[PDB]
Amino acid sequence: ARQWQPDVEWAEQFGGAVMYPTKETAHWKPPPWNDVDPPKDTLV
Amino acid sequence: MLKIIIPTTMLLPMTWMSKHNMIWINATVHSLLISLISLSLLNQLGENSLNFSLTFFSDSLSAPLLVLTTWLLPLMLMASQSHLSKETTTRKKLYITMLILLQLFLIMTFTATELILFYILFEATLVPTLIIITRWGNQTERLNAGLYFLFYTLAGSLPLLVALVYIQNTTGSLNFLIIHYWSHPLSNSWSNIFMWLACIMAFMVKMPLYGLHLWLPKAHVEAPIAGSMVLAAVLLKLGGYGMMRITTILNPLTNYMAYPFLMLSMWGMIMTSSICLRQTDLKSLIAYSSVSHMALVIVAIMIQTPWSFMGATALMIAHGLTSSMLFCLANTNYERVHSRTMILARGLQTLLPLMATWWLVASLTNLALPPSINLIGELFIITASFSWSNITIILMGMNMMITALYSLYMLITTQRGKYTHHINNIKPSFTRENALMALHILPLLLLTLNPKMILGPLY
Amino acid sequence: PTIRLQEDPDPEDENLYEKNPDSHGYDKDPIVDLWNMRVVFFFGFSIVLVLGSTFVAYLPDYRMQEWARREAERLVKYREANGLPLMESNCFDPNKIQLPEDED
Amino acid sequence: MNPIIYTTLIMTVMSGTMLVMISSHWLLIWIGFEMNLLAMIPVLMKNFNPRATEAATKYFLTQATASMMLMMAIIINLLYSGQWTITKMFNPVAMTMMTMALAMKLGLSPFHFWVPEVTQGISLQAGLLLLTWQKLAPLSVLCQISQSINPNLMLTMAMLSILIGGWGGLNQTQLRKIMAYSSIAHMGWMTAVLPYNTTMTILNLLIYITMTLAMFMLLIHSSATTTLSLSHTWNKMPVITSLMMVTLLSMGGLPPLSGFMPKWMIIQEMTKNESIIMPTLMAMTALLNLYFYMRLAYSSSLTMFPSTNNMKMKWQFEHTKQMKLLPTMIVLSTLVLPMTPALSSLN
Amino acid sequence: LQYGPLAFVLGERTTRKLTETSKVITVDGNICSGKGRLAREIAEKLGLRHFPEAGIHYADSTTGDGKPLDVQLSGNCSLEKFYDDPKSNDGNSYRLQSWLYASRLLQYADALEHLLSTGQGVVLERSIYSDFVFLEAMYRQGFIRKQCVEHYNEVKKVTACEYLPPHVVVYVDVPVPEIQSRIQKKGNPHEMKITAAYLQDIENAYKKTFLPEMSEKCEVLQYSAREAEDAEKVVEDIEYLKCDKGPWPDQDDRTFHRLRMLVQNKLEVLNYTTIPVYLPEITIGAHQSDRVFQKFTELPGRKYSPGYNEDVGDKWIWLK
Amino acid sequence: KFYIREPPHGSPDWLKVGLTLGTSVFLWIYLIKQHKEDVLEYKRRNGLE
Amino acid sequence: MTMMSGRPGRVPLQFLPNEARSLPPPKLTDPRLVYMGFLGYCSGLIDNAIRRRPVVSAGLHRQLLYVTSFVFFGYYLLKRQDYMYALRDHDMFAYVKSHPEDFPEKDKKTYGEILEEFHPVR
Ligand SMILES: CCCCCCCCCCCCCCCCCC(=O)OC[C@H](COP(=O)([O-])OCC(O)COP(=O)([O-])OC[C@@H](COC(=O)CCCCCCCCCCCCCCCCC)OC(=O)CCCCCCCCCCCCCCCCC)OC(=O)CCCCCCCCCCCCCCCCC
Ligand SMILES: CCCCCCCCCCCCCCCCC[C@@H](O)O[C@H](CO[C@H](O)CCCCCCCCCCCCCCC)COP(=O)(O)OCC[N+](C)(C)C
Ligand SMILES: CCCCCCCCCCCCCCCCC[C@@H](O)O[C@H](CO[C@H](O)CCCCCCCCCCCCCCC)COP(=O)(O)OCC[N+](C)(C)C
Ligand SMILES: CCCCCCCCCCCCCCCCC[C@@H](O)O[C@H](CO[C@H](O)CCCCCCCCCCCCCCC)COP(=O)(O)OCC[N+](C)(C)C
Ligand SMILES: CCCCCCCC/C=C\CCCCCCCC(=O)O[C@H](COC(=O)CCCCCCC/C=C/CCCCCCCC)COP(=O)(O)OCCN
Ligand SMILES: Nc1ncnc2c1ncn2[C@@H]1O[C@H](COP(=O)(O)OP(=O)(O)O)[C@@H](O)[C@H]1O
């Protein structure tokens, strides 16, 4: 018998871009790990 | 008051500089020594309180509460060291540190001369309790319990802070002596009604008043054993002590502002006692019993008579001892079978006879058998309530019956019948557990011989 | 893996009686366990309980109940020795009170 | 960025703030704000990426709008009295415009939208600067013109700041946005007491700056910016998470911690001016900040979240850089309530 | 004076130390090719510092005493049991691959730190740039899941973007039947189990992704098995290379300062290796995590910072 | 034991230790002297001693 | 909102006027000074704990400097605080004295002549 500690499914509640996900913010994606977005192919 | 306080603080580095295998021994020895020294506050002058200094003072209301706190610390250490054996040295020292900080905050709160200091310490008790519950709690549900315990308490106590600073602006002081000697009647106005509510609701939620009691089953059930012990024995009594102090500036408004709280407390007495009859969890049952007892204390404080104040003091002390004993008794079985369900282990008297004796005595003091101090307090409150109105006897009478019912129900379900066939890991009782039960019980029985000590200031 | 995580299995609790048939339930070390038992029993039952109960039993009469009884005895003797009322419904002297003069 | 250039820019930011703080002329105060913004824009983009560019762009637009409004208020004040000295504004309309400009510079609700976005878009060092040093100048200006300001507008914006800080903080998993909403609520507390006692504003600002410096330095030391990334710190640096737990409770305002002193002082001062109602709302609303601080403390220190295998390699390395003032900041953030009467030295 | 902004301000520069033989060199090749001997020979000839290939216990080599630690406190993966049971459902395979990528990242940081601080060049066996050949081989053989590949790519995308690629890429080419011959003649009972499809996958990944990719920003020197014992000839081939292709000629003192601040501070290097992506193969639960960390801190020199463990003979702890 | 520099080795930096202890000692003597001067000036201003 | 900033004859940035020297300095065993020293000691211990050094043993010169700095600054903080409270009381008493028509002394009654309302508890 041991004390209960959080597991992966518990921890994943805090992994979204936002707490309390709604229908609109469901398609929000969490930012990159470093704060660097992939460059856009906006060819000049 | 410094003589009691400094050694308690000393306990802190004594445990931080102790060898890894001597922390429990050292803490227990010196906690007991501190309890002995405190025992000397019971000498009371009579006409007035003992004022050690501008900052601290002791009362006949206060002296019993302090002795109970200091005595509860070593018992919590005895109860903790079993389930904390696998823990690292640093975390064990942190747990003991939490308990010591809690004792320190409690001693100061009871003896502070003025309300702002009382408020600060009365609120500081929240941090160690929350840390104990949420860090050492066995179940996942402890996090939710911690939030309930925190938020219910702060939602009551912040209006109290506003009311206190307003009162010091209008009166010039919050010192309790000046507050008492310069007391003036509270008019009947909306401003005074809301001042009354802001002065009362924090202590109401601490008791807890019925309907604002939902935090208590959560917090008392999800806490480790020492957390539960201190939550039931002492922390509930902060509300009663604070209410007894604060109701001096509230007259004559209390005459009719008390009606809804009296109705809630009497009917909810009946309600929580009935709830105890259909409970599948054994800690849940002890928690609701505490609620029922504190409802009686709320009635006693609201009706504002000398007999009711005496009964309230006696009942607070007796409840503190009995409830801690019942929690420890439940925890022994939980340690055996790793479940809180009451019908899991049955017929334990066949396997553990002396523990069954402890169970019987705890159940007998819970139902207030004469001449225990539980019945002294309950009888004094019931008489004062009868004087207040003769119809209270019906509610009081009903409560006495339901309490006997669920107390003996718990005893019969856990100790009698036949043992569950499958469970075969019920080892003999340890000396530690038996000594813990005796150290709960002997003091209660001893108190019957000298009833006046726990009676209070009115006596 | 059809698993979620790398986790230790939940261990079985160890019986203190297995390695120490007379183990008092305080500690795994038999010496420390014995001394924990001894300090608990001595400082709880011998020091605090017995000596503390004795100290509380012989506390001096600072509450002044003997004094109050003797004072009441003096007062009763003097008052029914002189034919005076045992008690007066007025706690304070009416000659030291100055009521508001007119009541209508 | 060359280290010498970075030092020159930090010194220009600080010297612009000091110009705002030592000046007697409205034009020099405006120049101080301009110099501060000019040097501050590059510090936000020090680590170049699209998010830092967007944050610096939103910051520049907001602050330059505030600057134009501030200048217009100064000019209207001059029009109705040939005065350049910063004392008490002569024109009511100029005072409204000035109050709104300084509220936009501070990020008070309803002008609060920029603070979370810009804070999320920059690094933790720039966030530290933005949320501590960038508050001194507008608060000092507001303290100077306090008698002139209308209580109804100020208190409206302050109560909005507290409410919106709490509500917005409830929804965050990113630590920089949590810190930003915390800052918004704290600013609301500082400005609610401003028309009554500027010493309480100064005390609140000092304690808030201490706690915010401690939190940001702890977040840099354990290089985490999300909740789940901070959930690992226990398996590498447990002392850091314990200290963060206690600092979090101090931010919540719970007694006997230092964080409780500013709230306690502000409520008391307000009751003196016969204002029972505003404070009851303010404390009951700060309960929300306490809730999301407690949630972060649950995920970070009071329970243990699962970890990764590569953490074992980190176990073998000490921190390359150590913060000199972090230990002092923690002690001042937690254990300073017994020293409360020392606030008299602030007036 | 520890290197930092203050050291860069007053004096210290990188370009004044770079002296034409700095030349980060990596010597790649399939399993059991003789790339290690060639690497040692190149390093001895050109006078560069040699780095033996980063293994499971590379990090142990650099901290404490350079002795390796137990496998449960360091690595928690087994190369032998990857050969025995590559499909075991305890995730040993991807755990091994991810730990080895982290080890190679640490070694690349150490090598770049050496080069940028002393000017002397370095020679590496493999790199974070060629580490992926084993990942692709494992994935094509059904040894790891698609999610493990995605996690690997995330970690690589946020870690490898911070450094400069090597100047020279030396590829020792040995066909796969010769590889199997050398494997059987070696003697290792576990390496015997390596199939031909696995080595073919490693070689295909090499020749179709790694070399075409490095040839765009680095100059590549391919050598068959027989022409690789000639270390003098390879060193002659390297001494007559005109490194005018990659990002290294675009580096002045400020980019070097940023890179040198990054390659020291190993925690900042390893930052993104433990990102909270919860793959079952690499996720460790709270109880095991706590147990293993407590056991690590009880190693004889690990409870305190390096100079503060008196169990290991440290002195003047009170005065340090 | 340890492999490389370990910048604080078996002996402590005596420069830094000396400077730290000197700073503490100087602060303490300055404080004592300041308090003596304060007491004397206060007694002189109010005519106590 | 700014009560003491505009007081007459106040030097801009002194921190300790000369008039403050007419006040008794705080004793060196002042419990507030002892608490400041305790704050410095806690700072030293947290310093040791963050850098993974032995907590009570590692840097004794460093801990001494922590304690000494806290005590040194706290002494002057206490001087300034006591001086500001002395100013407050001085000004309040002078103002009460110069405006007697705002602080009148009315004859007080003994409780024998004040009629107080009685409220029975029942
Ligand atoms: C109001 C009444 C009075 C109250 C006093 C004021 C409150 C207390 C003072 C606060 C500041 C003092 C201590 C700060 C530094 C502590 C940092 C630390 O890590 O300690 C470890 C360190 C032990 O580590 P170690 O010996 O190196 O070996 C352990 C292993 O390496 C393994 O070590 P490890 O590092 O690997 O273990 C990591 C561990 C490390 O975790 C910690 O150590 C927690 C430290 C957090 C610092 C708290 C912030 C600042 C203080 C604010 C206190 C707030 C009080 C108000 C209510 C809030 C409650 C917190 O974390 C965990 O394991 C995770 C557990 C998470 C559970 C959640 C609890 C976290 C917050 C609890 C805070 C409770 C208050 C502090 C309790 C005392 C702590 C020493 O502590 C000590 O041994 C020294 C403690 C004090 C000894 C000095 C005594 C003075 C000299 C003796 C003579 C007596 C003088 C009188 C003379 C009489 C005439 C003869
Ligand atoms: C679940 C547990 C929660 C905790 C329990 C909290 C209990 C709080 C209840 C407060 C007790 C009574 C409050 C005030 C006393 C009298 C209330 C009022 O109804 O009485 C009449 C008041 O008249 C009218 O009723 C006015 C009040 C009606 C408006 C209040 C709304 C009540 C609706 C119930 C809402 C539930 C409140 C609790 C929220 C949870 C008396 O007539 P009057 O002599 O003229 O007024 C006396 C005051 N004077 C002297 C200043 C003039
Ligand atoms: C298991 C085996 C059982 C069989 C064996 C049984 C043996 C006999 C048991 C029965 C003994 C009966 C004794 C009856 C009492 C006699 C003495 C009694 O009168 O003392 C009382 C006094 O009792 C004490 O006051 C008890 C005080 C309470 C003890 C507390 C212990 C320490 C505190 C522990 C923690 C407490 C936590 C809760 C605090 C609120 C009242 O004394 P009093 O009539 O006036 O004396 C008049 C003359 N004086 C005053 C000069 C003495
Ligand atoms: C969390 C605790 C807060 C920590 C605050 C930082 C403490 C360290 C800062 C370094 C101390 C030196 C500052 C002052 C040294 C000399 C400068 C002096 O001349 O300044 C005078 C002023 O003295 C300073 O203001 C006093 C600073 C003392 C701050 C500490 C009080 C904290 C309140 C209670 C918490 C206890 C803290 C414990 C200490 C560690 C100028 O007076 P004046 O120009 O006319 O007023 C300007 C403002 N006005 C006009 C709007 C009124
Ligand atoms: C965990 C749940 C606990 C919930 C407790 C909530 C109730 C607490 C009691 C009321 C809280 C606010 C009271 C205000 C504090 C007292 C201050 C005071 O007495 O000042 C009054 C001011 O009185 C008020 O302003 C109070 C008005 C109410 C404002 C906030 C409303 C919040 C909800 C009120 C009803 C809830 C109270 C009972 C609920 C109990 C919990 C269920 C008079 O001062 P003056 O303004 O000078 O008037 C005379 C001079 N002209
Ligand atoms: N990134 C990696 N993934 C899996 N295995 C690796 C990795 N790097 C090295 N190895 C293992 O190292 C073993 C020998 O290394 P190698 O360089 O190929 O031969 P040599 O011993 O001559 O240097 C090989 O059996 C290979 O599987």
Residue B264: how many other CB atoms lie within 10 Å: 20
Distance of alpha carbon G103 from alpha carbon G121, whole angstroms: 38
Distance CA B395, CA B271 (A): 11
Please give the Cα distance from D85 to D27 (Å, whole number). Answer: 9
Considering the domain boundaries, does residue G53 fall inside one? yes
Q: Two tokens at A27?
A: 């398609």
The CA distance from E167 to E48, in Å, is 13
Q: Say which residue the tokens 């400020």 belong to.
A: E254
User: Which residue's CA is the nearest one to ligand 3's atom 45?
Assistant: C57
- What is the C-alpha to C-alpha distance for residues B292 and B274, in angstroms, rounded to an integer? 10
| H helix intervals, D107-252 | 114-121, 124-132, 136-144, 151-169, 175-192, 198-221, 227-230, 238-251
The full DSSP string for B41-72 is GG---SSS-B--SSSB-B-TTHHHHHHHHHHH
Kindly tell me whether chain C and chain F come into contact, counting contact as 3+ Cβ pairs under 8 Å: no
- Is the CB of B185 less than 8 angstroms away from the CB of G119? yes
Domain that holds residue G67: 1-99
Question: From CA C72, how far away is CA C67, in angstroms rounded?
Answer: 9
Q: In what order do the strands lie in the sheet with E168-173?
A: E49-50, E122-124, E25-29, E168-173, E219-224
Question: Is residue E25 a contact partner of residue E112, using CB atoms and an 8 Å limit?
Answer: no
- Cis amide prior to E300 (ω within 30 degrees): no
E63 residue type, one letter: T
**Secondary structure class of B341 (helix, strand, coil):** strand
Residue D321 contacts B where some CB pair is shorter than 8 Å: no
How far apart (Å, rounded) are the C-alpha atoms in residues D66 and D71? 9
Ligand nearest to the CA of B66: 3
Distance B193 CA to ligand 2 centre (A): 9
Q: How many residues does chain D have?
A: 347
The two beta strands, E283-284 and D307-308, are: antiparallel
C-alpha–C-alpha distance, residues B388 and B255, integer Å: 11
- Packing angle, helices B190-206 and B237-246, rounded to 10: 150
Q: How far apart are the first and last CA of chain A?
A: 64
Q: For ligand 6, atom 13, which residue shows the shortest CA distance?
A: E31
For chain F, what is the total number of helices (H) and then of strands (E)? 1, 0
- The total number of structural domains in chain G stands at 1
**Residues whose CB falls within 8 Å of the CB of residue G74, separated by 6 or more in sequence, listed in order:** G32, G33, G36, G37
D89 lines ligand 1 (CB under 6 A): no
> What residue owns the CA closest to ligand 4's atom 4?
D206
Atom of ligand 4 nearest to the CA of D143: 51
Residue B345: how many CA atoms within 13 Å on its side-chain side? 23
- Of G24, G33, G11, the C-alpha closest to F41 is G24
Q: Of B392, B230, B179, nearest to B296 (Cα)?
A: B392
Q: Determined by which method? A: cryo-EM
CB contact under 8 A, A7 and C11: no
Which long-range contacts (C-beta less than 8 Å, at least 24 apart) are formed by G80-86? G80/D345, G80/G15, G80/G16, G80/G20, G81/D341, G81/D342, G81/D344, G81/D345, G82/G23, G82/G26, G83/G16, G83/G17, G83/G19, G83/G20, G83/G23, G84/D344, G84/D345, G84/D347, G84/G4, G85/D341, G85/D344, G86/G20, G86/G23
* C32, C51, C53 ranked by CB distance to B446: nearest: C53
| Distance of alpha carbon E164 from alpha carbon D330, whole angstroms | 39
* Domain residue ranges in chain A: 1-44
Give residue D112 CA to ligand 4 midpoint distance, Å: 29
The length of chain A, given as a count of residues: 44
Judge contact between B15 and B99, C-beta under 8 A: no
- On whether any CB of chain E is under 8 Å from the CB of F12, the answer is yes
Longest pairwise C-alpha distance within chain E: 63
Interface mutation vs chain D, best among B136, B162, B190, B205, most D CBs within 10 Å: B162
Query: At G76, which helix (H) or strand (E)?
Result: helix G60-98
Structure tokens at E275: 């990102």
> Largest Cα–Cα distance in chain F?
70
CA distance B158 to B88: 38
Residues in B closer than 8 angstroms to A1, CB to CB, are: 338
Neighbours of F, requiring at least 3 CB pairs below 8 Å, are E, G
Q: Extract the tokens encoding D91.
A: 């024109």
Q: Is residue G74 part of a domain?
A: yes
Give resolution, Å, one decimal: 2.6
- Please indicate whether, in this complex, the C-beta atoms of E89 and C6 are within 8 angstroms of each other: no
* Contact present, D254 and B150 (Cβ < 8 Å): no
Residue D85, beta-bridge partner list = D25
Backbone angles phi and psi of B48, in degrees to 5: -140, 165
Dihedral sign from CA coordinates of C73, C78, C81, C85? negative
Please state at what angle helix E132-140 crosses helix E146-159, rounded to 10 degrees: 170
For tokens 């408004």, the residue is: B253
The two beta strands, D307-308 and E122-124, are: unpaired
| Phi, psi at B145, each rounded to 5° | -65, -40
- Facing residues of E28 across strands? E171
Chain E residues closer than 8 Å to A32 by CB: 158
**In terms of Cα–Cα distance, which of C65, C63, C48 is closest to B43?**
C63
> Distance (Å, rounded) from C-alpha C12 to C-alpha G78?
59
* Ligand with an atom nearest the CA of residue G75: 4
Q: CB-CB: which of E89, E284, E291 is closest to C5?
A: E284
Token look-up 């994943």 returns A12
Radius of gyration of chain D (CA): 20
In the structure encoding, which two tokens stand for residue C33, read together?
């366990």
8 A C-beta contact, residue D178 and residue D296: yes
